[PDB]
């Protein structure tokens, strides 16, 4: 790898807690600049080195080379600011402009890597070992991308424009986000199917049973996960009940405990056999040539990465012949909500 | 390893479907004898070779050596019949007697390996890498033991004594077994706690909605799994509701689909954080010096092996502050219900 990738890849990424993001709210902007002009090169270089561990028959394909060419240019864009003066307000403005260009440059990274998966499937095959390696790589690659976008969004949202702090809501009303995502999925379901399940929500605030459940979170991530789950639940409910006059509703429970905030969504959409659950989270099995449901795009496994990004999880358990439950597990406390970042080391090197 | 272990370990175990067990019901007894005088040495030798891949600081401990001494004697007991005449009815009688001695000889294998786990925890420590290796080894070791006991039970039950075929019920009414296990857990809960949750059962027979759900299964395995889950659900319900006059009931759904038969048990016993679920399935973290609940003995992870033994699973998902669901996944068809057997090869050798 080039000199500059070698230098920054020997650092490991520095994970931030939701509280640190929040405690960071003038002097703030210079502080963000000097943090990000080091940290973004570290995160970019670490994933670029990991891309380089893919075999030549993957590495040399047009999709991987185009993604590499983007990351290289973004890394160079940022390295221009290493010697610049944080007191000069023109430097801070150019920095923000450059981060916006970088975010736009990477907007197509998800489907671009999909074309690499697709080419591999049809030029080398879709066996379980290939599936495992694609799953290991893309989980880490997409999680790294999520963490880079988070950093950039927090800077450009705060230092271009406070109940919200960039993309973080310190008082995120969870049931309200549930309702929004449900309404939007319903609108798509009503349009395609003239029929959509109703919604039942129940809250369990264990410590304060009469208090509405709020948390510190990134509500756009939470909306995306819920919307993806609602689309699948409604589709399954409509198609499994062609003969009923009744569509069963979708039920959601929001539970707040001492450590977890959990959201369980329940459909009666007929379920799938246990054997197929792993297929639904697999990038490789969900990949085909160009409203993508579970098993036919990356919405579900990327939704799980959003949950894992701050130490949560997203799990599915179905009952074939009846329905399916999904649980989003989130950390309840902002000090436990810490970025989960892949690192390039000899422990990651060995998996390949 | 000795000559005789080397020979039989180069065969791999031959897994049987539930239908094959069943289709095997005089001439049957000679057929069982000549099958088992080869297959039991194969299964015994394969696991003995795998025990020998443990490091010397595990291998040399008194617990592992005692288990090895048992398996060695059982392997020798069986090898006596290799040259004998299946037509001689005295040989068949001695064979059954010898299998009964072997089953009794191994009755204490589970807690004996526990003492080896306990010694290791306190003489070398309880780090995650040690936990992973103990989990990999004991899952395979205990599953192998379950498959050996199954084979022996089918022979001694059929050819010493038909709605039932040995330990298999071709018409196992699942809700009835659920009720039995619930009644027994309730009796223990009523005794310790003067109070026990009631039971609600619902069935969903997707193809034939009015028909009671039956399957081909080993009902003693199913009873054990349910009883273990009910004990935990009741304990959690009693302890989390010290202040309520009401104990919430435990709900069970039995779903029959085209491929899966699924049993979901639901409590409102307050739940646990997601972080602790893995602790509950871990042998190492559940091990302590001599009614063991999840996290304090091997009932739960061994219950999961019973489900996996015929291509099923047992999964837990909790909601901290509310309750916990458990799902037993079984194969609905007797031709899909095939023994899951560990094998000694270079692929198993590498994990160590
Ligand atoms: C409470 C939230 N509910 C759910 C959430 C999910 F993320 C997934 C599902 C849910 N509810 C379902 O029923 C489920 C499982 N489906 C939704 C409709 C599409 C469907 N996809 C399939 C189905 C079958 C196959 C196959 O191999 O035959 C294949 Cl490739 C793909 C998945
Ligand atoms: C529908 C079936 N229900 C359930 C099934 C389970 F197999 C487990 C549970 C269930 N329902 C619970 O609540 C659960 C999770 N408990 C039951 C009571 C005992 C309890 N054990 C513990 C708890 C906390 C810790 C700790 O680290 O603090 C530890 Cl070591 C151990 C587990
Ligand atoms: C396009 C991206 C998402 C993508 C597409 C395809 C792949 C496939 O990656 C594989 C496939 C097989 C093996 C085993 C092997 O034989 N290794 C040989 C090592 N030289 C290793 C890897 Cl990393 C990964 C990532
Ligand atoms: C008693 C039984 C259940 C038991 C108790 C304890 C253990 C612990 O087994 C370990 C622990 C560490 C390592 C890594 C290592 O450093 N390996 C060195 C290889 N020479 C490998 C193994 Cl197989 C297994 C089984």
Swiss-Prot record, chains A, B:
A Pfam cross-reference name: HATPase_c
InterPro entries: AK/P_DHK_N_sf, BCDHK/PDK_N, BCKD/PDK, HATPase_C_sf, His_kinase_dom
Reaction catalysed by this enzyme: L-seryl-[pyruvate dehydrogenase E1 alpha subunit] + ATP = O-phospho-L-seryl-[pyruvate dehydrogenase E1 alpha subunit] + ADP + H(+)
Positions carrying N6-succinyllysine: 346
Keywords: ATP-binding, Kinase, Mitochondrion, Nucleotide-binding, Phosphoprotein, Transferase, Transit peptide
Activity control note: Activity is enhanced by binding to the pyruvate dehydrogenase subunit DLAT. Inhibited by ADP and pyruvate; these compounds interfere with DLAT binding and thereby inhibit kinase activity. Inhibited by dichloroacetate. Inhibited by AZD7545; this compound interferes with DLAT binding and thereby inhibits kinase activity.
Domain Histidine kinase residue range list: 118-334
Homology family: Belongs to the PDK/BCKDK protein kinase family.
Protein name, per record: [Pyruvate dehydrogenase (acetyl-transferring)] kinase isozyme 2, mitochondrial
């Amino acid at each position: 790898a080039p000199k500059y990738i070698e230098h920054f890849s020997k650092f490991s990424p520095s994970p931030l807690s939701m509280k640190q993001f929040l405690d960071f709210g003038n002097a703030c902007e210079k502080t963000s600049f000097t943090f990000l002009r080091q940290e973004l090169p570290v995160r970019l270089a670490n994933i670029m080195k990991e891309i380089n561990l893919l075999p030549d028959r993957v590495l040399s394909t047009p999709s991987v080379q185009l993604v590499q060419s983007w990351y290289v240019q973004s890394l160079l864009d940022i390295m221009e600011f290493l010697d610049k003066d944080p007191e000069d307000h023109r430097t801070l403005s150019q920095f923000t402009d450059a981060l916006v260009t970088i975010r736009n440059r990477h907007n197509d990274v998800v489907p671009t890597m999909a074309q690499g998966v697709l080419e591999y499937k049809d030029t080398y095959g879709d066996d379980p070992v290939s599936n495992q390696n694609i799953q290991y790589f893309l989980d880490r690659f997409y999680l790294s991308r999520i963490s880079i976008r988070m950093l950039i969004n927090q800077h450009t949202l705060i230092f271009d424009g406070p109940k919200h702090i960039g993309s973080i809501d310190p008082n995120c009303n969870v049931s309200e986000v549930v309702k929004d995502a449900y309404d939007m999925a319903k609108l798509l379901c009503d349009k395609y199917y003239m029929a959509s399940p109703d919604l039942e929500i129940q809250e369990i605030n264990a410590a304060n049973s009469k208090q509405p459940i709020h948390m510190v979170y990134v509500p756009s991530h939470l909306y995306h996960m819920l919307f993806e789950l609602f689309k699948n639940a409604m589709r399954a409910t409509v198609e499994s009940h062609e003969s009923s006059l009744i569509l069963p509703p979708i039920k959601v429970m929001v539970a707040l405990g001492e450590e977890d905030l959990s959201i369980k969504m329940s459909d009666r959409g007929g379920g799938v056999p246990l054997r197929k659950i792993e297929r639904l989270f697999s990038y490789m099995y969900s990949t085909a040539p160009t409203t993508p449901l579970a098993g036919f795009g990356y919405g579900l496994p990327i939704s799980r990465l959003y949950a894992k990004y701050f130490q949560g999880d997203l799990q599915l358990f179905s009952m074939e012949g009846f329905g399916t439950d999904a649980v989003i597990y989130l950390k309840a406390l902002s000090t436990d909500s810490v970025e989960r970042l892949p690192v390039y080391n000899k422990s990651a090197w060995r998996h390949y």
